[PDB]
Design a protein around this nucleic acid. Structure first.
Ligand SMILES: [Zn+2]
Lengths: 117, 74, 121, 196, 84, 58, 183
RNA sequence: GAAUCAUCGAAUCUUUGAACGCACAUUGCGCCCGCCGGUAUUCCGGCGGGCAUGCCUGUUCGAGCGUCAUUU
RNA sequence: UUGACCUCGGAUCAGGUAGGAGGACCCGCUGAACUUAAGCAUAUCAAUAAGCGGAGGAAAAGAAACCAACAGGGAUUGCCCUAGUAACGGCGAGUGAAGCGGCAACAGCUCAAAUUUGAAAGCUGGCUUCGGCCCGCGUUGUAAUUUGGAGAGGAUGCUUU
């Protein structure tokens, strides 16, 4: 497929170790500001969509508003304690709800919360 | 004597009958600059003159565009 | 020949104007008699030129400081007294303007702020 | 002969066009305002219920502040603002509605006579949005309304409500539906006869 | 060798007429008269009224340049605009 | 290019920019994490010694 | 709620009351200048919906644009040509948005909302101080208004595959030869 | 407190140039305000601050039988 | 005769702003031909080069009128494969994506449509001892509340500054 000017639009990747150390220093600087805090946020267990990937789960975007309520975690406090919220996703089944509520109670057991000021 | 002295670029390329410089186009507000000749651009880019003001900007940014005096200066 | 800048900051404006008076006049008579036998007069002429430049800098410095003391309460400063920065730094939003937020977003951030926490292993 | 300025001619030609072109009944009902006597009696009542200006409101708040250092009923004012007034007439809180005839975008008041007539509030159409702004202490007021008055003049409003109804409302009743136009002059008639 | 006009150079620069002073001050005639009473401005007499203005009459009154400039910079003139 | 050739010929100093970064690489203060933070270690062995969790993802 | 009534009336724009108003306004706008100014919007409900407020720093301008082809068709919309002509006139202001106000057989008439980034009411208000930033210089020239976002195909779906991030950026991505180290 | 030293936060910054009172190929030609010198309130020369266009906010001035009120 | 309100103008009035440079990267407009098919015109080259307009340290895009048919997923962007697949074509030369999946990074929000109506509560100026005075903008709508996987209003009792 060398029909166009391939020479003027060729990208080389000699900075692949250079981008790697820059990426690690970004994670390093993120935990410098958020020192006791983790570097990421809680994501729910989500089932992959198509019939090819029905039998494998993955990490989704955020928790359902019903999933926060069943676990006893308030919705306007959840982003402040490191839990991602997604209002677009719905449960549609008790198995998706029960798996993610159990995940939120496990996060609740492992959590150390500090009192304001 | 088709061309005369140009005020802006200083070359003897100002057409006498048309009053338009063939190198920069003096009556036009924009300096003439075409992309089909890279060589003519390196003859007139920033850096080919004396840098009476642009050369002192980098030192002021190094210190955060500081204003004032040193403490206890006379 | 050379006037140190140390004593110039002490004296007032009217006494500086006399030194500025004698400095160019001594320079002018020197320059007339320098065109013949330009030897150590030429070193002295250079000392005169630096001394003239030094008192002019000191005269100017106390002038705008007095102007800046006048304009310490008024809103609009003159153009020459304003700081330079860059063009874009001057048209940039002010620190109070860029930082202020809506009331509905202040009420949210007051009662639900970013808490600090840790997760056990 | 002499040449008029461009904006002078444009605003004068807007006169002739408004009186020549025949106007749909939504806009044509604004050409029928009320009389001199009903305007003065309406504004006699309305001046009694003027809002408080910025000076005597600041002094009135200064009253209660210095007394708190060392008990009021409901204020009754003329109501103004389009979305405030049409909200009041949609909720049947308004007693009388007075509409200006010269709102420069006419669409902002062109639904008002029908909305007041559907809801049951009697309305009137007066000359001068500047005259209504005088009542309001603004420059211009597109509409004003009266909701509730004190018991001193409950009778005066009732007589004005009737006088607007039998003096203005049952006189323009046929002209609400009918189109405008028909003010052709001698020059327009001779030109139309030449064209035909 | 420069050509200089007799109309623009001479007593015309020094003395100015009352009408020209009123137009320069951009004030009404009673306003200009009242400011003359307070500030003590005086019409005076030029040496040659024809040299001041070729089209001039003895009934017309002139004025000096400097006191007119004082009336231009008068704070009362600023106060007149504020009072109006 | 014509810029850089002018600086070599000029008797003007090359303005040396110090190595300043936007974001600090280490925590600071008088808190528990800042006192026990090791500069030479990385994030994972620092949070190992603290007893905490850095990443909540897979 | 006067603007809900205006919204329904603007929908019905071939009807008798509005077509009368659109006829008499087009005659007036024709004999005014091309790029003249409006003290108040002719459609206050559309100006309000698009971001106009009755605040110092908001101005309205009316533009007439010639209609027709360029059988070559000018890919720029007539609204985009209208917005570019205000910005070249009011070079100190920022083009917020624009809307249709009138039509003819020779011209189309648009009303353009402009925001002054150098007023103090604008810089104080955090709902409009975003336009004070230097990234938003001449939004109408870069296709950053509602007309420009339409003509650039900035929607999501299988239907807008080539233009959902910029066609020139997508064409650069799809024509780039990516060579890695350990190939 | 030397230096063809370094730093650099205060100044100075001729003619042009987007180039901005008009012209420009002349160190020329005008207006408003102020100062200085040489016979000097009148003459001459020099100096200082100003005088471009489009647009926005305010200020002020003006026009329009556009248009309202005005016998209590 | 007086005084509005509306519109249009003047001012060497006060306060500001735009032009030009750069253009490696970015956003738009406009737009070739050589070449290939052992000739050549569809095509290709190429939605490229040249030309015009416009920004920043990044730009742009972006919180679904989305993808999906699943036990569903869930703003945008970039890498890996998908894949030289689907799809289109003097079906020759050729052209040529995307969803899914693995990663990198992740963050959400502001309005308009409501009557504050028991009180335009909002804002620009310029005058100040600066502590607070007027002028104007504005009801043809400036604050507060609210933005549809919402919300408001009453009641209710805890929890927050
Ligand atoms: Zn030239």
């Amino acid at each position: 497929h060398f029909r166009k000017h391939w020479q003027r639009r060729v990208r080389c990747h000699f900075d692949q170790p250079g981008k790697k150390v820059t990426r690690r220093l970004a994670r390093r600087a993120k935990a410098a500001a958020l020192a006791p805090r983790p570097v990421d946020k809680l994501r729910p267990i989500v089932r992959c969509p198509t019939v090819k990937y029905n039998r494998r789960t993955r990490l989704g975007r955020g928790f359902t508003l019903e999933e926060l309520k069943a676990a006893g975690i308030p919705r306007l406090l959840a982003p402040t304690i490191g839990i991602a919220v997604d209002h677009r996703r719905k449960n549609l089944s008790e198995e998706s709800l029960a798996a993610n509520v159990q995940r939120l109670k496990d996060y609740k057991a492992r959590l150390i919360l500090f009192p304001r000021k | 004597k088709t061309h005369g002295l140009c005020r802006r670029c200083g070359r003897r390329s100002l057409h006498n009958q048309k009053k338009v410089c063939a190198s920069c186009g003096y009556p036009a507000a924009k300096t003439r600059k075409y992309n089909w000749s890279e060589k003519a651009k390196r003859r007139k880019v920033t850096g080919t003159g004396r840098m009476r003001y642009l050369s002192t900007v980098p030192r002021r940014f190094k210190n955060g565009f500081r204003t004032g005096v040193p403490k206890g200066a006379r | 020949g050379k006037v140190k800048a140390g004593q110039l900051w002490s004296k007032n404006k009217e006494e500086l104007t006399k030194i500025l008076g004698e400095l160019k006049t001594e320079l002018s008579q020197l320059r007339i008699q320098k065109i013949s036998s330009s030897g150590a007069k030429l070193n002295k002429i250079h000392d005169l030129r630096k001394s003239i430049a030094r008192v002019l800098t000191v005269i100017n410095a106390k002038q705008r400081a007095q102007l800046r003391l006048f304009y310490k309460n008024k809103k609009y400063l003159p153009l020459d007294l304003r700081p330079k920065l860059t063009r874009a730094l001057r048209r940039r939003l002010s620190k109070e303007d860029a930082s202020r937020v809506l009331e509905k977003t202040k009420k949210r951030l007051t009662h639900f702020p970013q808490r600090k926490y840790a997760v056990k292993a | 002969m002499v040449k008029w300025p461009e904006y002078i001619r444009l605003q004068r030609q807007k006169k002739i066009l408004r009186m020549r072109l025949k106007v749909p009944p939504a806009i044509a009902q604004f050409q029928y305002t009320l009389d001199k006597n009903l305007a003065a009696q309406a504004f006699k009542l309305l001046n009694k219920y003027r809002p408080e200006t910025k000076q005597e409101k600041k002094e009135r708040l200064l009253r209660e502040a210095t007394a708190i250092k060392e008990v009021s009923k409901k204020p009754y004012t003329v109501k103004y603002g389009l979305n405030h007034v049409v909200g009041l007439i949609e909720n049947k809180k308004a007693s009388l509605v007075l509409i200006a005839n010269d709102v420069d975008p006419i669409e902002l008041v062109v639904f008002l006579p029908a909305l007041c007539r559907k809801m049951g509030i009697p309305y009137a159409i007066i000359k001068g949005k500047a005259r209504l702004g005088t009542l309001v202490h603004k420059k211009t007021a597109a509409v004003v309304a009266i909701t509730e008055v004190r018991s001193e003049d409950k009778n005066e409003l009732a007589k004005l409500i009737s006088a607007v109804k039998e003096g203005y409302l049952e006189k323009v009743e046929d002209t609400r539906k009918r189109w405008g136009g028909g003010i052709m002059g001698f020059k327009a008639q001779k030109r139309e006869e030449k064209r035909k | 060798g420069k050509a200089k006009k007799k109309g623009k150079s001479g007593a015309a620069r020094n003395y100015m007429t009352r009408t020209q002073a009123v137009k320069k001050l951009q004030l009404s005639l009673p306003d200009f008269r009242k400011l003359c009473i307070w500030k003590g401005i005086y019409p005076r007499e030029p040496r040659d009224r024809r040299k001041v203005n070729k089209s001039a009459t003895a009934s017309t009154t002139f004025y000096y340049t400097k006191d007119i400039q004082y009336l231009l910079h008068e704070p009362l003139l600023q106060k007149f605009r504020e009072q109006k | 290019r014509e810029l850089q050739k002018r600086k070599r010929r000029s008797s003007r100093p090359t303005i040396r920019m110090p190595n300043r970064r936007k974001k600090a690489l280490n925590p600071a203060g008088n808190n528990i994490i800042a006192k026990s933070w090791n500069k030479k270690e990385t994030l994972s062995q620092n949070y190992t010694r603290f007893g905490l969790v850095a990443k909540l993802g897979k | 709620g006067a603007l809900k009534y205006l919204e329904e009336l603007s929908k019905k724009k071939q009807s008798d009351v509005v077509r009368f108003l659109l006829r008499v306004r087009c005659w007036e706008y024709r004999q005014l200048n091309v790029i003249h100014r409006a003290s108040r919007p002719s459609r206050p409900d559309k100006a309000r919906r698009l971001g106009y407020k009755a605040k110092q720093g908001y101005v309205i301008y009316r533009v007439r644009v010639r209609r027709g082809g360029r059988q070559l068709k000018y890919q720029r919309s007539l609204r985009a040509t209208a917005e570019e002509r205000v910005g070249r006139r009011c070079s100190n202001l920022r083009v917020l948005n624009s809307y249709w106000v009138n039509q003819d057989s020779t011209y189309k008439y648009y009303e353009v909302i402009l925001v002054d980034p150098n007023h103090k009411a604008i810089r104080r208000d955090p709902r409009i101080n975003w336009i004070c930033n230097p990234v938003h210089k001449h939004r109408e020239c870069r296709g950053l208004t509602s007309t420009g976002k339409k003509s650039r195909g900035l929607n999501k779906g299988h239907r807008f595959n080539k233009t959902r991030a910029g066609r020139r950026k997508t064409w650069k991505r799809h024509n780039t030869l990516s060579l890695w180290r350990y190939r």
